[PDB]
């Protein structure tokens with residue numbers, strides 16, 4: 011199980027960080043259990059947390075919400091997009107779709123239970 015409250019960066023890793031591609035239905039059961047509903051969609055970045063956190067130190071750019079703490083990866087990355095096809099919670103079923111895209115993440119200061127990097131990724135801002 012996960013604690014009563016994880017940090018935003020830790021939830022970002024649980025939700026979007028799977029360096030090895032896996033099965034959607036398998037990898038979604040944890041997230042849907044923490045949310046108590048079948049998540050309609052989620053993107054898995056096939057990269058190490060160390061790699062995605064390193065994007066936080068590249069040039070800061072604008073986000074969708076017009077905040078300015080977003081950073082774009084310098085290179086495309088492998089991804090799998092899970093899509094809720096059927097099933098009632100907790101029996102959520104998904105279809106997988108591979109992608110090779112750039113990503114933009116929003117970063118913020120580490121919270122006191124996160125690793126002490128200058129910045130940590132907390133939100134998958136966009137795929138492009």
Ligand SMILES: Nc1ncnc2c1ncn2[C@@H]1O[C@H](COP(=O)(O)O)[C@@H](O)[C@H]1O
Pocket residue numbers: 018073074075077079116117118132133134135
């Ligand atoms: N543009 C943004 N800049 C900074 N933090 C954000 C941004 N969008 C979402 N967040 C944070 O990311 C968390 C949720 O992200 P997510 O679950 O990926 O939607 C919350 O703690 C938000 O405050």
